Amino acid sequence: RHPVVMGNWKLNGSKEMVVDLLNGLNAELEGVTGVDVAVAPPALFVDLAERTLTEAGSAIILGAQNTDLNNSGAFTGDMSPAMLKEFGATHIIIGHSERREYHAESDEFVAKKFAFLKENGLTPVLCIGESDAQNEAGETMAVCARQLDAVINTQGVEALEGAIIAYEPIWAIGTGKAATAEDAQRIHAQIRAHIAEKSEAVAKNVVIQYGGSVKPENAAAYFAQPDIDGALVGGAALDAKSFAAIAKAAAEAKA
Amino acid sequence: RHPVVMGNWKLNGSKEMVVDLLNGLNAELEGVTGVDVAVAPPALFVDLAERTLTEAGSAIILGAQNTDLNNSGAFTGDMSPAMLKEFGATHIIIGHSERREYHAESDEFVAKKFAFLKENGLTPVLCIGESDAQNEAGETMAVCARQLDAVINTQGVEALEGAIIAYEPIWAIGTGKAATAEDAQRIHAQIRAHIAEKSEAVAKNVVIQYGGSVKPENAAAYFAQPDIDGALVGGAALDAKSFAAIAKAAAEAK
Known part of the structure; x- marks a missing residue:
């Protein structure tokens, strides 16, 4: 599996910031070809x-932070996959914990977005992850399997073909506290085993990204694990030198 | 009150269309004065x-179809008032029924948005309106009074200065079953009246637009009524001829 490193800019961006970051990032990756680098700016x-x-x-690669379920029509304020496609945007984050929490997006709603993306020829970056309590209560795979199953049971394992899954331990997002690469590798192997129970072909090829607090100081440790295929980066995505460092560790690690 | 005509494009737009429409629009409005025309393209x-x-x-004027409650930070997928300002957008539609129905936006949520917009120097276009059932039941004003008080009773009447209120009966939205100009006037007079019960200075100044199914063929009947200060247009906004027509009607009448 070819690694994929995606930067989720979240609610950050300004006309000057966008061009400087994209211009610099591109200068930094000037010979780097063993990774897919995608960026997701605000709509x-x-x-x-x-x-x-x-x-x-x-x-x-250009992506986005979310999508809605319609391409056109009377839906004020909605995000349309067809409009995204006019800008060449292809990788669309859905199910992020911030939306699952702040906007109360359910597994059923998120899975509906997964299907619509697939219908439109776009690449969903499905986010899944347990909370602090679920973690402590030892329900990590229960939560994960449940969230994946929302698309697997309604659409079929082959729906994951051409999709990216980003495992994010909720308590690791923005908190500075990243899971260890060994525990992360442990969860990825099980997420993979779950999909493989339904299809080995799909399981072997699905890119599973890690989404805790990936930083240049801990990237290589992560990319060193066999079941960690990339990273969904937040805060470190906002610095061209930081994001480029993370991308390179993935390229060297998987060659 | 100077009339304001706003077009809500909803989920409609393409690179060709946006340019075409906006150019044609500007051509048709060439020299028309006495109306604030606004457009709300998808973000x-x-x-x-x-x-x-x-x-x-x-x-x-440039507007947008929604807003969220933060300008920056860890809020994946949100709409930032501050970022909207960077493109010169000033009129933000909030509480539209499509978002209330589909995204389950409550009166409280829409009100927080109203407050955040004011705090960011943006102009809220607060959407209020009753369903078909609420109308049959004779609850129209109760519903408009409830949705409005979510702001009034919490931020005070003065909060409505500089904002736009769009009264849109849900059953008239994109249905072609528009409210008569007389009902619309009745309701707008009672909304204004509800407001004047707390401040007549605010009440006589607030722009109240009608939403229903405004079309070039019915726009001037509305614009003749004294309490209808403009119109929030959906379908007729996707065509330059129509929408410029509606805008011209408001200018003439007011």
């Missing part, structure tokens, strides 16, 4: 991001 | 809309 800057990446002939 | 096309309008030196 307001998807246009400026396409313009910049195009002008530079960048290979950096 | 993905605000950038395009700003560039297109500026090039045209257009006076059309």
Whole structure:
């Protein structure tokens, strides 16, 4: 599996910040080819991001932070996969914990977004993860299996083909406290085993990303594990030198 | 009150259309004065809309269809008032029924958004309105009074200064079954009245738009009523001829 490193900018961005970060990031990756680097800016800057990446002939992939379930029609304020496709955006984060929490997005709603993305030819980056209590109560795989099963049971294991899964221990997001690479590897192998119970072909090829607090200081340790195929980066994504460092560790690690 | 005409494009837009529409729009409104015309493209096309309008030196106002409660931070997928300002967007539609129905946005949530927008110097276009059943039951004003008080009773009447209220009966939205100009006027007069029971200064100044199914063929009947200060247009906004028509009607009448 070819590693994939994705930067989720979250609610960060300004006209000047977008072009400087994308311009610099691209300079830093100037010979780096063993990783897929994607970037997800706020909806307001998807246009400026396409313009910049195009002008530079960048290979950096463009994504988005969320989607809704319609392409057009009377749905004020909604995100449309067809409109995203006009900007070349392909990797769409869905199910992030911040949305699952702040917007109360259920597994059923998230799985519906997974199917619509697939229907539209886009690549869903399905986020799954346990909370502090579930973790402590030892229900990690129970939660994970449950969230994956929302798409597997309604759509079939083959739906995961061409999808990216980002495992994020909720308590590791933004907190500075990252899971250890050994525990992360342990959860990824089980997430993989779960899918393999239904299909070995799908399981062997699905890119499972790690999403705790990946930083340049702990990246290589993660990319060293066999079942960790990349990272969904938040805070370190906002620094071209940091994100480029993380991307390189993945490229060297998986060659 | 100076009339305001706003077009809500909803989930409609493409790179070709946005440019075409906005250009045609500016052509048709060439020289028309006495109406504030506004457009709310999907967030993905605000950038395009700003560039297109500026090039045209257009006076059309830029709006957006929703907002969230933070300007920055760890809030994946949210709409930032601060980021919207960067593209010159000022009029933000909130509480629209499509978002209340589909995204289950409560009166409290919509009100927090109203407050955050004011705090960021943006202009809220507060959407209120009753369902078909609530209408049959004779609950129209109870519902508009409830949705409005969520702001009034918490932020005070003064909070409505500088904001726009769009009264839209849910059953008239994209149905072609529009409210008569007389009902619309009845309701707008009672909303204004409800407000004047706390401040007549605020009440006589607040712009109240009608939502239902405004079309070029029925716009002036509405714009003749004294308490209808403009219109929030959906379908007729996706065409330059129609929407410029509606805008011209408001200018003439007021």
